[PDB]
């Protein structure tokens, strides 16, 4: 067991192994210098991990999730620790990842992208997503500030305005969503990268749905067939502004294939939305698409998700996960 040390930061007690030095708060996440490796790291101290049942499950969910992600386009776990010598002391959890230089927002402000940047950047997201999706994990909150990019235009997916990127079925509250909610988002992100501006800058969610509907159009028979509620079906029709544009005239100076890919991602009907795996093979990624370098996830046991347990059991589960962690090489 390493030796620990205490520090008060922006009115909060951080205690970490001395391995991590020079903590400085970026937002409760500090940047720190991992002296084992000389690399800058990010340290998250989970707020009130075991305060309620809901908190306890999320603590656990995030640990499991971080312990599973092992792909170059997705954030991974360097370290997890607790200053606690035992289960009974266990009340803090800290997670460690690579520190990130920039997110997609920063890249946006700082340089105007080549077509070739947009291809390489979206390619990485999709390759990340084919790996998340293959584990039956749905991101749900893809947006530029959750995409980290280094100096070589390499990208990692993480999770820390969200709605600009949300699939419309989420904003119309179905209890059941599939993985292609994440593809809606990728298309919102791509569009932004090519156009320089936000595709649906909605003041509120109904504003969002309106902008969506005038660009992609009102749903086909085939999709109206799948909506059970008359109220829903009426409400949707109730938009209802100046018609399905052109789409292609919103992106006029862009690469014809980019625009084609975007047409297959920004499909109202999530049954018809292109998947990450299919999107990988779309001609717009001809420069990067390598079929033998696009791996899928190991089996991932999320039977815990359906489970309703006591704080202490969630706290115990989380403790086993902490104790059994194996650092990467
Ligand atoms: C230190 C840490 C601990 C945990 C996480 N967690 C995650 O990144 C994550 C990734 C994917 C998911 C996927 N997921 C599936 C289900 N749902 C609903 C969404 C979540 C969730 C959390 C990130 C980090 N890293 C992190 N977080 C925020 C900011 C920074 C950071 C800040 C500044 C400079 N460099 C890095 N670094
Ligand atoms: C206002 C524009 C939004 C129209 C409704 C979005 C259509 C979303 O698509 C729907 O996704 C569901 C969610 O899992 C699936 O069950 C349905 O099969 C699919 O058609």
Q: Is the CB of 220 under 6 A from ligand 2?
A: no
Q: Given phi > 0 = left and psi -120 to 50 = alpha, else beta, which region is 98? A: beta
Query: Who contacts 319 (Cβ-Cβ below 8 Å, separation ≥6)?
Result: 82, 87, 90
Query: Who contacts 256 (Cβ-Cβ below 8 Å, separation ≥6)?
Result: none
| CA–CA distances in Å: residue 262 to residues 144, 176, 184, 190 | 17, 24, 9, 8
Token digits of residue 139: 């991101």
**Residues making up the binding site for ATP:** 26-29, 44
| CA–CA distances in Å: residue 239 to residues 212, 217, 230 | 10, 9, 15
DSSP state of 292: G
Superfamily of domain 102-296: Transferase(Phosphotransferase) domain 1 (1.10.510.10)
Token digits of residue 211: 């902008």
Alpha-carbon distance of 231 to 266, in angstroms, equals: 24
Token digits of residue 252: 């006029």
Query: Who contacts 136 (Cβ-Cβ below 8 Å, separation ≥6)?
Result: 179, 300, 302
Alpha-carbon distance of 31 to 96, in angstroms, equals: 10
Which CATH architecture is the domain 14-101 placed in? 2-Layer Sandwich (3.30)
Alpha-carbon distance of 213 to 195, in angstroms, equals: 19
Alpha-carbon distance of 69 to 56, in angstroms, equals: 20
| CA–CA distances in Å: residue 303 to residues 64, 136, 152, 315, 321 | 12, 12, 38, 17, 15
Alpha-carbon distance of 236 to 216, in angstroms, equals: 13
Token digits of residue 204: 């509120």
Block residue for tokens 């862009």: 254
Ligand 2 pocket, mutate which of 226, 267, 274, 275 (most atoms under 8 A from CB): 226
Domains of the chain, by residue range, sit at 14-101, 102-296
Catalytic entry in 116, 136, 159, 260: 159
Which experiment gave this structure? X-ray
Alpha-carbon distance of 81 to 88, in angstroms, equals: 15
Identify whether the C-beta of residue 297 lies closer than 8 Å to the C-beta of residue 131.
yes
């Amino acid at each position: 067991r390493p030796t620990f040390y205490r520090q008060e930061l922006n009115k909060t007690i951080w205690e970490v192994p001395e391995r991590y030095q020079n903590l400085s708060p970026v937002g409760s996440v500090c940047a720190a210098f991992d002296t084992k490796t000389g690399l800058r790291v990010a340290v998250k101290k989970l707020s009130r991990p075991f305060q309620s049942i809901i908190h306890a499950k999320r603590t656990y969910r995030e640990l499991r999730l971080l312990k599973h992600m092992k792909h170059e386009n997705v954030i991974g776990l360097l370290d997890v620790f607790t200053p606690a010598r035992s289960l009974e002391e266990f009340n803090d959890v800290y997670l460690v990842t690579h520190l990130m230089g920039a997110d997609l927002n920063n890249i946006v402000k700082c340089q105007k992208l080549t077509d070739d940047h947009v291809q390489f950047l979206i390619y990485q997201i999709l390759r990340g997503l084919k790996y998340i999706h293959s584990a039956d994990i749905i991101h749900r909150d893809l947006k530029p500030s959750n995409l980290a990019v280094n100096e070589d235009c390499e990208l990692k997916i993480l999770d820390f305005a969200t709605r600009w990127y949300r699939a419309p079925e989420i904003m119309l509250n179905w209890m059941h969503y599939n993985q292609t909610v994440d593809i809606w988002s990728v298309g919102c992100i791509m569009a932004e990268l090519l156009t320089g501006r936000t595709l649906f800058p909605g003041t509120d969610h109904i504003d969002q749905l309106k902008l969506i509907l005038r660009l992609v159009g009102t749903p086909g028979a085939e999709l109206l067939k799948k909506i059970s509620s008359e109220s829903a079906r009426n409400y949707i029709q109730s938009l209802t502004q100046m018609p399905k544009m052109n789409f292609a005239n919103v992106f006029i100076g862009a690469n014809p294939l980019a625009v084609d890919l975007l047409e297959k991602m920004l499909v109202l009907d999530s049954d018809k939305r292109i998947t990450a795996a299919q999107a990988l093979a779309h001609a717009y990624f001809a420069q990067y698409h390598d079929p033998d370098d696009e791996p899928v996830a190991d089996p991932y046991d999320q039977s815990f998700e359906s489970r309703d347990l006591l704080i202490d059991e969630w706290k115990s589960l989380t403790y086993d996960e902490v104790i059994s962690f194996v650092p990467p090489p």
